[PDB]
């Protein structure tokens, strides 16, 4: 379960399912992950700066760490999210946050 925790609600992605007994040939969505590499050829200056980006060549607002999935159980302010899990199985949670540190 891809547990994204954004500002004041949750989203569960179901990144992958593979039952040991044998079932659920399911996977997540590799697309939708768009970086924010500000690798413009030139900035405000005339030449030379060729700024790549603040940190590791990327701007702080990147959200490449956030992983997305096909089945998203987004929680609205008026609809509490309900992550449904199979009983008896090993459930991994891949935790991430969109905006701010918080807890799960």
């Amino acid at each position: 379960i891809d547990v994204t925790a954004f500002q004041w609600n949750w989203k569960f992605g179901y990144q992958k399912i593979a039952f040991a007994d044998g079932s659920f040939d399911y996977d997540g969505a590799d697309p939708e992950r768009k970086e924010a590499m500000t690798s413009r050829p030139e900035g405000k200056d005339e030449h030379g700066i060729e700024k790549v980006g603040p940190i590791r060549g990327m701007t702080p607002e990147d959200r490449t760490y956030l992983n997305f999935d096909k089945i998203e159980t987004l929680g609205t302010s008026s609809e509490i999210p309900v992550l449904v899990l199979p009983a008896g199985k090993r459930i991994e949670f891949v935790l991430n946050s969109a905006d701010v540190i918080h807890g799960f």
Binding site: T4, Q7, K34, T59, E61, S77, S78, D99
Partner: protein
């Protein structure tokens, strides 16, 4: 409508066949193909803030629109008849809907905003800065149709949200958040410090305490 496609071709032939040649086919390294972009994407540029800039640039200014509302519709119907794609939300009369696109939820109209789109912008709706020479604009100017069309026809470096990704309902709610959200004093103090402390300290220097 026959007239809307006809007018669209005449206005298209005189503005963007330089970057989208002939029937909405993109000019390589000047502009993209306009096949599949549809009326709402055309709504998101000439009707919305980001009218395309003739000088090539990472981002464009929401420069003043170069086409009027009937013209924006004629230009749009040309690219929806040529291409086939998203259409701008319209009211019962047939005008581009703005008030109808105001979502009932602002609480969830907001929660949607923070997970989806708040980050490139501001929680306030103020701009954010982005990729190469790319910024996320302040969404204060945008009317509600503008708001729905940035999401349905993802502009440039702005993630595209399909009606399936964000439902027509939520897009209205999103509009509701990103719209509901949208001498003597220094001179006298400068005297009383700089000038008057200077004068008084000078007097204390010249004069004598006693």
């Amino acid at each position: 409508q026959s007239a809307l496609l006809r007018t669209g071709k005449q206005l298209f032939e005189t503005s963007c066949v330089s970057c989208h040649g002939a029937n909405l086919q993109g000019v390589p390294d000047r502009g993209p193909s306009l096949i599949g972009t549809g009326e709402a994407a055309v709504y998101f540029q000439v009707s919305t803030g980001r009218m395309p800039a003739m000088r090539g640039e990472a981002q464009a200014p929401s420069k003043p629109p170069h086409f009027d509302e009937s013209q924006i519709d004629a230009l749009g119907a040309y690219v929806q008849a040529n291409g086939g794609g998203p259409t701008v939300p319209r009211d019962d009369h047939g005008a581009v809907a703005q008030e109808s696109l105001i979502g009932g939820d602002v609480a969830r109209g907001g929660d949607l905003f923070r997970l989806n789109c708040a980050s490139c912008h501001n929680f306030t709706g103020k701009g954010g800065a982005l990729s190469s020479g790319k910024y996320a604009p302040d969404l204060g100017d945008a009317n509600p149709a503008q708001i729905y069309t940035a999401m349905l026809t993802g502009p440039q470096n702005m993630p595209k949200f399909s009606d399936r990704q964000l439902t027509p309902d939520e897009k209205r709610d999103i509009v509701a958040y990103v719209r509901e959200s949208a001498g003597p004093a220094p001179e006298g103090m400068a005297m009383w410090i700089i000038g008057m402390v200077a004068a008084i300290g000078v007097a204390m220097w010249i004069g004598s305490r006693a």
